[PDB]
């Protein structure tokens, strides 16, 4: 039994948990989008600009701890997604990039083809720098094995992969795609590693379990919550890891942000003699903000299929394998006070400050509203989100690339089964990708978006306030919402903010944009310290 | 300031280099002129480039320092790729210095003799067989580049490549300073040593297995001391034959699995504390099976790393680990050598040669360092008493033997070298002996002549191509300035060896006629083991 | 119908004209040598050291204008042939390098394998720098096509190629090797090129046809002799091209060597307004010796499948295609005096000088002896050979790598069908590879070798006479000849030289080594000028 290549790929993706395919077509990709649309194997969602295709697919992958799918056309499409994919690579999100391409017999007539780079292979070379595996599906006989190998790499390494499909191969007959190639694990090495880790955590006086991205990438949040419970150790997330263990009976104590975070959490972390960095990205965003210099060599670090502690490394140790191995050595368990969330918004005629937004959101939850998953862009919106009650959070906490927010909220809500997403984004970032909200009506989603409008690239002003180029105009985003099919309202007072948030939650059917005017110079408590240090 | 070429020679001497082996060519004449005129390093010329590399390799192994091989562009350098690949494989810091076109040559629309596809082709090839490279085409950066490159050769103990454009030889530069420092984390080192020491003390039958890095980094005395303080026996790998030759308590023997002494093999393979010190994990050192060694259960220190208990400590120099272990330790039945050569009218077998050599040592002769080529000559040397031994026990490239013996004796301050080599290998590089007179050396060379590539016959006896002609090597010795004698009986063998040892001034070639089909038991069992492995 | 891979390769080589296979085995190459020996598809000739395997195969390829074959083992064998292959690449000789290698399943047991470089692929990477095409025959299904592609490249480009054969693939079943892939030629471009070339040669007042290596590499000597005849133009060879058109009714006028060659030939060449460089290597050895600077841009240059003239280039123009195209535009023809050969040896008690050797050889030919093909090493032996009457000549006239001589003479005589080869070589070069003569008895050849013994690397002394490292000992090569199965005689007087040469020609059955003692400082007329300028 054979099937068409494109159909075999779509089915292989669905078999691996992909829930949708985001994309923007082009002539080279038309045959492929046709198969996607007509077969309906994966729900096809189009967007306006490719960066959003990349971010939405990344968000979908983060939301479901599975493969995200982003389909584009040759050159103009793919090169326009390099930044979003570089970001997914950095934050370990398995985005499957599928690009259309000239057919295997094209480009031999002495003519250059629209969308090609210096050579026809230039695009492939560029994507090799931002993906962990690649394949040009130009040989039907090899396609099934290549798809399995590439998709297998994305799942094992939890990073983007690249598939280039010559258009004349879309309907080529192939055999069904088999299973991912297996990645061997030495059981004796895993046993030794787990034994050493457990002994180190057990000998520490003040052990701390610090969770980061891989914990959700490999679907280990529940097991890790159980591990901490069994070890009797507190859990704190890294900055990038904000949003992890949101459903654990015992939530993490808080998020470590060094001099910019809660003093007690910072103290617990930096003075720990048993700091277990579980699935952590060793980024400046997660650790350069330390008050006391943190000797990374004295921590236990599990990441990228390896575990390092005691100045040595155990290679080929999958995080899931380690977590299971530790749980197997721990009997079931037969507590520090968590960092308090800002609450008590004063809904009066006073101006809006970032913390007021955090209080407004937290107050509704405390009043009975089930928290919403939060999608944050990079800016003070993210540093503010750090003080918000969430049902998970996705943000570019390491790559720090702006534009992520609105498209991520869109991608997440496309696969959320009816659950609304709360998006926080600044005016700078909204000018980049907030416009994608114009697609909500067709996609059938109604995210609530809180836009922090300080008519400025404020994070940059804070870094270098003397400069004038960080000044932005006052765009009337709420006024422009209607043009995009959503409900927009500009709020200037804390009372208007509270009222706005209430109506947005009471109004489904279309995206709700709450444009919160914030004076320049007014920051979140977290961001101030992050720079004031 | 000083001339770039002189600055490099002084930098080499500063690091212990003792000589410069080489063959000139037009692109290298200016460099060879500086070397000859400054006399910073004695300049020894040979006949063919493979020998230049082998000799430089041997000198480096002999003094645990840098070896120096100078050649000309293309025809010189490419002809040394094999010797350098072998030095890389066997961790010998050979500094390859090649002449090259001047920085302003090759721009008149003409291809230059000796160039590869492009002028940079040679450089690209050498990147594959060296750990560091530099084209000294900028006087201002030359001192620092020389320091970086020579520093890498010392730290990694592997060959490096220096390409010197002709017009830069006499360019003015500042003196060369010290090697860049390779930082070592003291906390990591302490933890590494603590784990290793604990593992060795926990074992009921610990074994110290020494290999090349032990000599490369000048650690033989310290390792011998280490074995004594730990109270553990020392055995060498096949490649490591010759190590700890003058230790108060020499190694018990050399591990060769099914091909070596059964007691040594049992000790190694049954050990629950096998410490592979500076060991190359090659098929030659370990595939000689018997009982599969789980390498993951050993302690392996090699290439500036230490692996045990399924994990690795990076950036841990072997020397640092040995010193760290000694700092944690308070001060605190050898395999017999075959003897009794029967000086009679029977034919000569490989073992008879080992008995002849060993009998002399037991009679009072201080052992000589042995230089061996690849062939049954090496497997036979495993049973000889030596004052050290150098052989291509891993790379296994033929031609190493004679040139290595020559290179070693050039830097041995008077000590004579014994070389063992087969007829096949001698046909490749034995001719370099014609350089002995000019070099002022007189090595003793025992040529195993069976008119055959016998090791290959053993692997595939049905083939006719392993049958070689009978070359009269002893008869050709005079033409090269040496004394040769062909021997066929054990009695002639004994007489020739005594005569050779009692005759200085000219190399002594003893051509021992060994019958085809006659091979050392070690080689026979080695090959039989290999055949079953790949069955 | 299928056959074993090794057998298919050997047959593919024979189908392309290969006449023998030179090699030295090793364990990784044993299975392959077994097939070669037992099938006898290609006569198998072994040598002592790999450099000779490379040189002999190169010489065989030059001798028959076909593929040469050199078989070695992994690492120790192959890396030992890099220099000879670099030389074949430089002088455009299609040497097929076949190396044994570990089987496809070896090297996965945690152990390094004897003969490997840094990695198992290190050797392959190195050979890519000195060959025009490569293939590891590790896939039976692809092997036939890969062999055809690689062998096809060697023949089209006339340069070495590399084939790596994992030992477990030697007897793998494969389909027979098909034809070489075709290399397209634009007929309109060839027509335009030929028309322009013909017009330029026709408009020149003093046109000259200068032949070089490609003329024999592509078997065009006879057609090129006819072309010169039809154009009515004199032919001169480049230095590298010495030996070309040896059988043409009208031999070339001589060999161009600038200030070091004949003044009249140098004048004709450098003052030519129609200099056609046919198949020429633009090397310093061929043109840096010019008295008057030669503006290469004003010549017509056909080489590497292209033709350049009038400041422009015609790509993809095969030399054979151009020669045929020119002949097609020239009607059959319905003469300058050649450079005279040195003759009249005075066979007395005087000492030997290089020119005396040239006179001795030339005198026997003039007296009735059919000239012999000459194999020359690099040294004054080559500069002397420039004045010898030959039936072709092979020498490293561009790469200039020593060691070429004896092995080249050996390789050539192995495929010469009984014709003896005359080899000229210096003491320096003989110390490197002259020992290969010990194989003559088993190979069944009896070359005549004239060894120029000046106990010195004289060419280098001439370049820098103040140095002492160019001094060599006096090796008794004639005395060592017997040990190698040949007849050696040392000659010191011109009378002994003449006598020696006569006996050597009268003695077949074993190689004849005539060791001619030459005082240091005594050079060929050609070499002196080559430096004295
Ligand atoms: C794609 C990209 N281009 C530029 C930048 C550099 C940047 C980091 S933060 C910032 C200003 C963001 O202004 P915004 O109004 O969105 O939020 P806020 O600072 O709180 O006022 C910029 C331009 C990044 N990170 N990504
Ligand atoms: C440069 C190179 N080319 C080929 C080979 C392959 C080989 C390994 S063993 C052997 C035969 C050696 O014959 P020899 O007479 O020297 O000693 P013996 O076997 O005891 O009779 C060959 C050709 C190697 N290792 N290196
Ligand atoms: C493989 C290689 N290594 C070094 C060199 C450099 C060289 C070019 S010419 C020469 C001296 C040759 O002495 P020979 O006795 O053979 O003939 P003659 O000069 O007339 O006395 C050398 C060393 C080359 N070209 N190739
Ligand atoms: O579809 C796309 O991606 C395009 O940009 C269309 C560009 C127009 C176009 C140019 C050349 C051939 C076919 C179409
Ligand atoms: O990957 C990120 O963006 C993070 O902040 C880690 C938490 C991700 C996340 C948690 C819960 C639901 C969806 C996503
Ligand atoms: O010295 C060497 O290495 C040689 O090969 C000499 C080749 C002769 C030579 C050719 C072109 C320029 C200069 C010299
Ligand atoms: O490197 C080799 O070839 C070995 O066999 C290891 C021992 C080397 C060696 C020991 C003693 C003196 C000189 C050299
Ligand atoms: O045959 C060759 O090329 C050799 O060098 C033989 C080296 C000895 C050898 C080592 C490891 C496995 C099998 C044999
Ligand atoms: O390729 C070379 O070495 C040359 O000198 C060109 C002539 C080659 C050559 C001519 C005649 C018979 C055999 C070979
Ligand atoms: Mg802003
Ligand atoms: Mg032999
Ligand atoms: Mg000479």
From Swiss-Prot, chain B:
Its cofactor is a metal cation; thiamine diphosphate. It catalyses: indole-3-pyruvate + H(+) = indole-3-acetaldehyde + CO2. Its EC number is 4.1.1.74. One of its GO terms (biological process) is aromatic amino acid family catabolic process to alcohol via Ehrlich pathway. Keywords: Decarboxylase, Lyase, Magnesium, Metal-binding, Thiamine pyrophosphate. One of its GO terms (cellular component) is cytosol. The keyword Heme does not apply. Pfam families: TPP_enzyme_C (PF02775), TPP_enzyme_M (PF00205), TPP_enzyme_N (PF02776). It is an enzyme of class 4 (lyase). Thiamine diphosphate binds at residue 49. Binds 1 metal ion per subunit. Binds 1 thiamine pyrophosphate per subunit. Residues 376-454 are annotated as: Thiamine pyrophosphate binding. GO terms for molecular function: indolepyruvate decarboxylase activity; magnesium ion binding; pyruvate decarboxylase activity; thiamine pyrophosphate binding. Pathway: Plant hormone metabolism; auxin biosynthesis. InterPro entries: DHS-like_NAD/FAD-binding_dom, IPDC, PDC/IPDC-like, THDP-binding, Thiamin_PyroP_enz_cen_dom, Thiamin_PyroP_enz_TPP-bd_dom, TPP_enzyme_TPP-bd, TPP_PYR_PDC_IPDC-like. Mg(2+) binds at residues 423, 450. The keyword Lyase applies. Signal peptide: none annotated. Belongs to the TPP enzyme family. This is Indole-3-pyruvate decarboxylase. The lineage of its organism: Bacteria, Pseudomonadati, Pseudomonadota, Alphaproteobacteria, Rhodospirillales.
């Amino acid at each position: 039994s054979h099937m068409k290549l494109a159909e075999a790929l779509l089915r292989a993706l669905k078999d691996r948990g992909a829930q949708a395919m985001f994309g923007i077509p082009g002539d080279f990709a038309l045959p492929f989008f046709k198969v996607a649309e007509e077969t309906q194997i994966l729900p096809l969602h189009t967007l306006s600009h490719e960066p959003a295709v990349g971010f939405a697919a990344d968000a979908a992958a983060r939301y479901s701890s599975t493969l995200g799918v982003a389909a584009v056309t040759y050159g103009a499409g793919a090169f326009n997604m390099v930044n979003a994919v570089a970001g997914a690579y950095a934050e370990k999100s398995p985005v499957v990039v599928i690009s259309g391409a000239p057919g295997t017999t094209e480009g031999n007539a002495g003519l250059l083809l629209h969308h090609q780079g210096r050579t026809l292979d230039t695009q492939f070379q560029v994507f090799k720098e931002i993906t962990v595996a690649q394949a040009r599906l130009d040989d039907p006989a090899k396609a099934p094995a290549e798809i399995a190998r590439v998709l297998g790499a994305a799942r094992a390494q939890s990073r983007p992969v690249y598939l280039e499909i010559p258009r004349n191969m879309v309907n080529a007959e192939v055999e069904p795609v088999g299973d991912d190639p297996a990645w061997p694990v030495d059981r004796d090495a895993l046993a030794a590693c787990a034994d050493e880790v457990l002994a180190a955590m057990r000998s520490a006086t003040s052990p701390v379990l610090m969770v980061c991205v891989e914990v959700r990438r490999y679907g280990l949040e529940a097991k890790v919550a159980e591990l901490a419970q069994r070890l009797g150790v507190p859990v704190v997330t890294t900055f990038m890891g904000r949003g992890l263990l949101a459903d654990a009976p015992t939530p993490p104590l808080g998020t470590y942000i060094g001099v910019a975070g809660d003093a007690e959490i910072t103290r617990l972390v930096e003075e720990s003699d048993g700091l277990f960095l579980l699935g952590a990205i060793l980024s400046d965003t997660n650790f350069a903000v330390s008050q006391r210099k943190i000797d990374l060599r004295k921590t236990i670090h599990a990441f990228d299929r390896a575990v390092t502690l005691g100045y040595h490394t155990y290679a080929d140790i999958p995080l899931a394998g380690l977590v299971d191995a530790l749980l197997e050595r721990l009997p079931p368990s037969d507590g520090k006070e968590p960092h308090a969330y800002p609450t008590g918004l004063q809904a009066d005629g006073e101006p809006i400050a970032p913390m007021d937004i955090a209080r407004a959101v937290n107050d509704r939850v405390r009043a009975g509203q089930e928290p919403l998953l939060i999608a944050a862009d990079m800016g003070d919106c993210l540093f503010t989100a750090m003080d918000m009650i969430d049902a998970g959070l996705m943000a570019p906490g390491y790559y720090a690339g702006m534009g992520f927010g609105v498209p991520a909220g869109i991608g997440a809500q496309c696969v959320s089964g009816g659950k609304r997403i709360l998006t926080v984004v600044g005016d700078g970032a909204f000018q980049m990708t907030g416009w994608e909200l114009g697609n909500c009506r067709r996609l059938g989603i109604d995210p609530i978006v809180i836009l922090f409008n300080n008519a400025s690239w404020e994070m940059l002003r804070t870094f270098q306030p003397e400069s004038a180029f960080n000044d932005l105009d006052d765009w009337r985003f709420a006024d422009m919402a209607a043009g995009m099919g959503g409900d927009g309202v500009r709020v200037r007072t804390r009372a208007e903010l509270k009222a706005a948030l209430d109506k947005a939650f009471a109004t489904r059917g279309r995206f709700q944009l709450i444009e919160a005017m914030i004076p320049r110079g007014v920051l979140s408590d977290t961001l101030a310290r992050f720079v004031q240090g």
